[PDB]
Design a protein around this ligand. Structure first.
Ligand SMILES: CC(=O)c1ccc(O)cc1
Ligand SMILES: CC(=O)c1ccc(O)cc1
Ligand SMILES: O=C(O)CNC(=O)C(=O)O
Ligand code: NI
Ligand SMILES: [Zn+2]
Length: 331
């Protein structure tokens, strides 16, 4: 078996290898990349997402989210308080202000230490979940707005035609902005391109060990667990690498820099944080190997999770028994 220790693998495709997206994902998996739950892909030196980022300041963040923590430094939840709209230019200025700016630090490791020590004592503002794309329409390779759709994948694999669309989302971040432990909707893949700015650090649990993380989460957030059989779907729980280690949970970490892609694989739990002002673009996608994960994906039915229009069809076709109780939660 390839990659038996489930290490995060890093790939350097040539420009020729960068032409066929599906083929390259399949290649990475042939080398065992999916066992980690996360892979890094460094694009060929000849490639670019767009010519410049000099003209993005007038993008609107309609609903910036203030991420307020509760709990202890290594085990906490965060809730999202809605703030007034601001442009990306205004957001960048806010990120760089004394209140919100990245502190002096020696290296990535020092900054990671500071994050886990001090995150709960601040409430950074995240410009997350904004429909749109920053890829130039003329960028033909790995353009996250031009991928084959999940609906078409299901149709090719299973012969059923379904409603729904999937499009990319932009994420504007600042120091300490945080993504909670989660897998993707319907345990899909995700792909994430860091367009500009400061790094993003990721933590990931191998898919084969995801249930170990779930068991620890139930122990650490007992009220939440009683309220919902899949509460990690709420995307509000954080557990530090120190706490994961203390509890013997297998995981890895890696830092993504501007100009790099990350792919998360079906049922690969991940969490992380931004180092300073940045912008990422991400979208879900599927392959033939995903179908069996989609069939088995846990669902939140307490109603907190509340997901996309397109998820309806996935649950309806892949999980017909659940579909009744699930849509009861969505509605
Ligand atoms: C990366 C960059 O050039 C850039 C420019 C203007 C902004 O408002 C935000 C980012
Ligand atoms: C000029 C340039 O760097 C550039 C990059 C990406 C494009 O899709 C189109 C032009
Ligand atoms: O970048 C973020 O805040 C969160 N991104 C993801 O969870 C992803 O790309 O799958
Ligand atoms: Ni994700
Ligand atoms: Zn729930």
């Amino acid at each position: 078996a390839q990659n038996p220790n489930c290490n995060i693998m890093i790939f350097h495709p040539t420009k020729e290898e960068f032409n066929d997206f599906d083929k390259y994902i399949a290649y990475m998996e042939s080398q065992g990349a999916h066992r980690a739950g996360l892979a890094k892909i460094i694009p060929p030196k000849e490639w670019k997402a767009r010519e410049t980022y000099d003209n993005i300041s007038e993008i609107l963040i309609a609903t910036p989210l203030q991420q307020v923590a509760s709990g202890r430094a290594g085990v906490f939840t965060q809730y999202h308080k809605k703030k007034k709209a601001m442009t990306v230019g205004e957001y960048r200025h806010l990120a760089n202000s004394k209140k919100y700016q990245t502190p002096p630090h020696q290296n990535f490791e020092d900054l990671e230490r500071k994050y886990w020590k001090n995150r709960i004592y601040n409430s950074p503002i995240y410009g997350a979940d904004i429909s749109g794309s920053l890829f130039d329409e003329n960028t033909k390779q790995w353009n996250l707005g031009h991928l084959g759709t999940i609906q078409d994948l299901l149709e090719k694999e299973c012969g059923v035609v379904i409603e729904g669309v999937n499009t990319p989302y932009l994420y504007f971040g600042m120091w300490k902005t945080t993504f909670a432990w989660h897998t993707e909707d319907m345990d899909l893949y995700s792909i994430n391109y860091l367009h500009l700015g400061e790094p993003k650090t990721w933590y990931v649990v191998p898919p084969e060990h995801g249930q170990r993380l779930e068991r620890l989460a139930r122990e650490l957030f007992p009220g939440s667990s009683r309220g919902c059989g899949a509460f990690l779907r709420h995307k509000v729980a954080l557990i530090s690498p120190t706490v994961l280690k203390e509890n013997g949970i297998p995981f890895n970490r890696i830092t993504q820099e501007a100009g790099e892609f990350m792919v998360t694989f079906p049922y690969g739990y991940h969490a992380g944080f931004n180092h300073g002002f940045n912008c990422a673009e991400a979208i879900n996608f599927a392959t033939p190997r995903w179908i069996d994960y989609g069939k088995m994906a846990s669902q939140c039915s307490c109603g907190e999770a509340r997901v996309t229009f397109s998820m309806d069809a996935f649950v309806r076709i892949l999980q017909p028994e659940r579909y009744d109780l699930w849509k009861r939660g969505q509605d």
